[PDB]
Amino acid sequence: PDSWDKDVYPEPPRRTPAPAPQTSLPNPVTYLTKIFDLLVDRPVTLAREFIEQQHAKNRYYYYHREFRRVPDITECEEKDILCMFEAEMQWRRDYKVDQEIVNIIQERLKACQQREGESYRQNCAKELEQFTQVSKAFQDRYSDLGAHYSARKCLAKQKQRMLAERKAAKEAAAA
Amino acid sequence: MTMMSGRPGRVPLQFLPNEARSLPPPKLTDPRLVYMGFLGYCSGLIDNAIRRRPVVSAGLHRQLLYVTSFVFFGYYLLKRQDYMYALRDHDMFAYVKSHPEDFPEKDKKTYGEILEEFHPVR
Numbered sequence: 001p002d003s004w005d006k007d008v009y010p011e012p013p014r015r016t017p018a019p020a021p022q023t024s025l026p027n028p029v030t031y032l033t034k035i036f037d038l039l040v041d042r043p044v045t046l047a048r049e050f051i052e053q054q055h056a057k058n059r060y061y062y063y064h065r066e067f068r069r070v071p072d073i074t075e076c077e078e079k080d081i082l083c084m085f086e087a088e089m090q091w092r093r094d095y096k097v098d099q100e101i102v103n104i105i106q107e108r109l110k111a112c113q114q115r116e117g118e119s120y121r122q123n124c125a126k127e128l129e130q131f132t133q134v135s136k137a138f139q140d141r142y143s144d145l146g147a148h149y150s151a152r153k154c155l156a157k158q159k160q161r162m163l164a165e166r167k168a169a170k171e172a173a174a175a
Numbered sequence: 176m177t178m179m180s181g182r183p184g185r186v187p188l189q190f191l192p193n194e195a196r197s198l199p200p201p202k203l204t205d206p207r208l209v210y211m212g213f214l215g216y217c218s219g220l221i222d223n224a225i226r227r228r229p230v231v232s233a234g235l236h237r238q239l240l241y242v243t244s245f246v247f248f249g250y251y252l253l254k255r256q257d258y259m260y261a262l263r264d265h266d267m268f269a270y271v272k273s274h275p276e277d278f279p280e281k282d283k284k285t286y287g288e289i290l291e292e293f294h295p296v297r
């Protein structure tokens with residue numbers, strides 16, 4: 001339905017064929033579907049309608065909490081404990097958000113594989129490359145930090161990678 | 176091995192110099208005083224137990240005297256201890272102020288410009 005955003009969780013237009021009977025024999029699945037409808041789907045719908053009627057009389061709201069952007073660990077001096085603490089909290093929040101992003105991409109990949117059936121190897125290449133890109137980024141950001149991780153160790157890993165890349169680029173410039 | 180016994184202007188046997196009166200006295204509900212009173216109560220209970228008396232109810236005046244004596248001594252003990260720590264901090268700060276060349280203020284670098292070594296966990 002409209003509860004979740006259709007851009008974060010997209011799906012194809014859901015093309016379905018029309019029934020084209022070829023025999024005079026009656027279809028038992030259609031009769032069973034009608035029986036199931038009349039015996040299950042209508043009482044459930046009525047119960048849900050009553051439940052929604054009761055819910056409408058009591059409407060209240062809950063809000064999504066917004067967090068300001070505080071300075072990160074790069075702009076904290078060596079022994080400033082308060083700035084370090086706030087930067088570490090922000091970094092942990094960002095780590096959780098990145099984990100959830102990877103989770104969303106993985107959900108997309110799983111949905112594509114189930115939906116495409118026998119042609120998943122061809123019709124899920126875009127989801128696969130999206131997951132490859134996000135996985136590489138997440139690995140570069142957070143892998144091998146180990147337990148007792150921190151924003152300082154992430155910064156050290158990033159700086160080591162930057163130094164290696166800069167040395168490689170400089171040595172390629174002389175080639 | 177003897178840090179503050181030779182401090183200048185130290186009267187031998189006061190236990191409480193006049194300069195200590197510039198410090199806030201400990202509150203009468205200080206948790207350390209409550210612990211001293213609890214120690215006095217335990218002493219009273221042990222006194223009752225040793226003399227083969229009812230531990231909880233035998234000597235009420237004796238237990239009251241125990242608690243009162245412990246609290247009374249602990250108040251002055253806490254005053255002296257706080258005064259000694261105040262002297263330590265005062266002398267430390269004065270010495271730091273008078274010797275700037277041994278406690279220099281060097282500019283601190285931000286973590287974006289300090290290079291730390293990374294040790295991968297694997």
Ligand SMILES: CCCCCCCCCCCCCCCCCC(=O)OC[C@H](COP(=O)([O-])OCC(O)COP(=O)([O-])OC[C@@H](COC(=O)CCCCCCCCCCCCCCCCC)OC(=O)CCCCCCCCCCCCCCCCC)OC(=O)CCCCCCCCCCCCCCCCC
Nearest residue numbers: 216217218219220221222223224225227228229230231232
């Ligand atoms: C860390 C946070 C805080 C923790 C607190 C610290 C630990 C507790 C406090 C320690 C000191 C307090 C008690 C010491 C004096 C008691 C001496 C004694 O023997 O007790 C007998 C006595 C019972 O005897 P009785 O009633 O006269 O009649 C029975 C006969 O006497 C029949 O008696 P009997 O003599 O014929 O029985 C013979 C018995 C006699 O043997 C004993 O009774 C053992 C007594 C050993 C004395 C403890 C050592 C000194 C204190 C050091 C504690 C170290 C703690 C650190 C951890 C290490 C653990 C060892 O011998 C044996 O059976 C052999 C036992 C050998 C086994 C080894 C274990 C023994 C040592 C264990 C000590 C554990 C700590 C004390 C626990 C409480 C003990 C009462 O006990 C009591 O009734 C008094 C206990 C406390 C009651 C007062 C509570 C106040 C009332 C409520 C007011 C609320 C206040 C707050 C207000 C809130 C608003 C509403």
Ligand SMILES: CCCCCCCCCCCCCCCCC[C@@H](O)O[C@H](CO[C@H](O)CCCCCCCCCCCCCCC)COP(=O)(O)OCC[N+](C)(C)C
Nearest residue numbers: 177179180185186187188189190191211214248249252255
């Ligand atoms: C098991 C716990 C220890 C118990 C210790 C015995 C407790 C009973 C003692 C009775 C208290 C009265 C003693 C002192 C009162 C007046 C004398 C006073 O003037 O003495 C001054 C000094 O005051 C006393 O020394 C302080 C005694 C306080 C002892 C308590 C400390 C215990 C350590 C922490 C455990 C907490 C104990 C809890 C209390 C029951 C003199 O200063 P000064 O002449 O310049 O120092 C001599 C030593 N120098 C020169 C080498 C430095």
